Design an enzyme around this catalytic site. Structure first.
Site, PDB file in Angstrom:
ATOM      1  N   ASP A  15       0.808  -1.206   0.000  1.00 35.83           N
ATOM      2  CA  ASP A  15       0.000   0.000   0.000  1.00 35.83           C
ATOM      3  C   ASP A  15       0.851   1.270   0.000  1.00 35.83           C
ATOM      4  O   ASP A  15       0.281   2.355   0.047  1.00 35.83           O
ATOM      5  CB  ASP A  15      -0.946  -0.005   1.217  1.00 35.83           C
ATOM      6  CG  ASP A  15      -0.237   0.099   2.552  1.00 35.83           C
ATOM      7  OD1 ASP A  15      -0.909   0.043   3.608  1.00 35.83           O
ATOM      8  OD2 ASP A  15       1.008   0.244   2.601  1.00 35.83           O
ATOM      9  N   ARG A  29       1.020   6.850  -0.105  1.00 32.61           N
ATOM     10  CA  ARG A  29       0.086   5.849   0.376  1.00 32.61           C
ATOM     11  C   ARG A  29      -1.001   5.695  -0.687  1.00 32.61           C
ATOM     12  O   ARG A  29      -1.531   6.672  -1.217  1.00 32.61           O
ATOM     13  CB  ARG A  29      -0.460   6.273   1.739  1.00 32.61           C
ATOM     14  CG  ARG A  29      -1.626   5.472   2.275  1.00 32.61           C
ATOM     15  CD  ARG A  29      -1.192   4.056   2.612  1.00 32.61           C
ATOM     16  NE  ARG A  29      -2.126   3.329   3.462  1.00 32.61           N
ATOM     17  CZ  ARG A  29      -3.198   2.680   3.023  1.00 32.61           C
ATOM     18  NH1 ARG A  29      -3.518   2.643   1.733  1.00 32.61           N
ATOM     19  NH2 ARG A  29      -3.975   2.048   3.893  1.00 32.61           N
ATOM     20  N   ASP A  34      -6.951  -1.006   1.577  1.00 30.19           N
ATOM     21  CA  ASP A  34      -6.226  -1.644   2.657  1.00 30.19           C
ATOM     22  C   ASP A  34      -5.692  -2.999   2.174  1.00 30.19           C
ATOM     23  O   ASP A  34      -6.497  -3.846   1.782  1.00 30.19           O
ATOM     24  CB  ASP A  34      -7.079  -1.890   3.900  1.00 30.19           C
ATOM     25  CG  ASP A  34      -7.585  -0.647   4.597  1.00 30.19           C
ATOM     26  OD1 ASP A  34      -6.895   0.397   4.578  1.00 30.19           O
ATOM     27  OD2 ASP A  34      -8.691  -0.712   5.181  1.00 30.19           O
ATOM     28  N   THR A  35      -4.387  -3.161   2.237  1.00 30.31           N
ATOM     29  CA  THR A  35      -3.726  -4.398   1.886  1.00 30.31           C
ATOM     30  C   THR A  35      -3.186  -5.067   3.138  1.00 30.31           C
ATOM     31  O   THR A  35      -2.856  -4.408   4.113  1.00 30.31           O
ATOM     32  CB  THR A  35      -2.508  -4.246   0.954  1.00 30.31           C
ATOM     33  OG1 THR A  35      -1.526  -3.438   1.620  1.00 30.31           O
ATOM     34  CG2 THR A  35      -2.887  -3.519  -0.318  1.00 30.31           C
ATOM     35  N   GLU A  37      -0.335  -6.304   5.275  1.00 31.89           N
ATOM     36  CA  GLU A  37       0.939  -5.582   5.228  1.00 31.89           C
ATOM     37  C   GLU A  37       2.099  -6.461   5.650  1.00 31.89           C
ATOM     38  O   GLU A  37       1.921  -7.484   6.304  1.00 31.89           O
ATOM     39  CB  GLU A  37       0.873  -4.335   6.115  1.00 31.89           C
ATOM     40  CG  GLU A  37      -0.316  -3.433   5.776  1.00 31.89           C
ATOM     41  CD  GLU A  37      -0.508  -2.371   6.849  1.00 31.89           C
ATOM     42  OE1 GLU A  37      -1.647  -2.146   7.301  1.00 31.89           O
ATOM     43  OE2 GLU A  37       0.515  -1.765   7.231  1.00 31.89           O
ATOM     44  N   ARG A  81       2.779  11.284   4.199  1.00 33.20           N
ATOM     45  CA  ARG A  81       2.665  10.551   2.939  1.00 33.20           C
ATOM     46  C   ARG A  81       1.686  11.157   1.950  1.00 33.20           C
ATOM     47  O   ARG A  81       0.556  11.520   2.319  1.00 33.20           O
ATOM     48  CB  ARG A  81       2.191   9.113   3.237  1.00 33.20           C
ATOM     49  CG  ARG A  81       3.107   8.365   4.183  1.00 33.20           C
ATOM     50  CD  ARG A  81       2.676   6.914   4.272  1.00 33.20           C
ATOM     51  NE  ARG A  81       1.472   6.811   5.104  1.00 33.20           N
ATOM     52  CZ  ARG A  81       0.917   5.642   5.387  1.00 33.20           C
ATOM     53  NH1 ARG A  81       1.439   4.510   4.921  1.00 33.20           N
ATOM     54  NH2 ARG A  81      -0.166   5.624   6.136  1.00 33.20           N
TER      55      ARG A  81
END
Length: 135
Positions: A15, A29, A34-35, A37, A81
């Protein structure tokens, strides 16, 4: 919204990618996804994390052209980010991950939700095909 060019510096996680943007190094970002992580300690490295990470990495490392697309809202988060849609040769990475069942559409914060619909349609298809995260 418009796309601006950037140059890969380093992929960091599913991500997050570091890019050269208007001559400065910046961490980005990926908006709205949402991955699993490989970072953070509340998970550490999770299930499908290495996979989501490899996919992002291969997709930006093998691209001819990377472009970033900011949404209509704030363009950085509290960690400094950049918040954006990222494109490898025309294909949106955030959408690719969701279409493959390697990410979920995250909680949405208006007004940074221009491609929400688009992404949710990809997620429904990945669920229906029972890919990865949904398998």
């Amino acid at each position: 919204l418009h796309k601006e060019p950037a140059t890969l510096i380093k992929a960091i996680d599913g991500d997050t990618v570091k890019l050269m943007y208007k001559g400065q190094p910046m961490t980005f970002r990926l908006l709205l996804v949402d991955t699993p992580e490989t970072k953070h300690p509340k998970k550490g490295v999770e299930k499908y994390g290495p996979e989501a990470s490899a996919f992002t990495k291969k997709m930006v490392e093998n691209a001819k052209k990377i472009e970033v697309e900011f949404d209509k809202g704030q363009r950085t988060d509290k960690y400094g980010r950049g918040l954006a849609y990222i494109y490898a040769d025309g294909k949106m990475v955030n959408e690719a991950l969701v279409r493959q069942g390697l990410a979920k559409v995250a909680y949405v914060y208006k007004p940074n939700n221009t491609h929400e619909q688009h992404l949710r349609k990809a997620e429904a298809q990945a669920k229906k095909e029972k890919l990865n995260i949904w398998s």
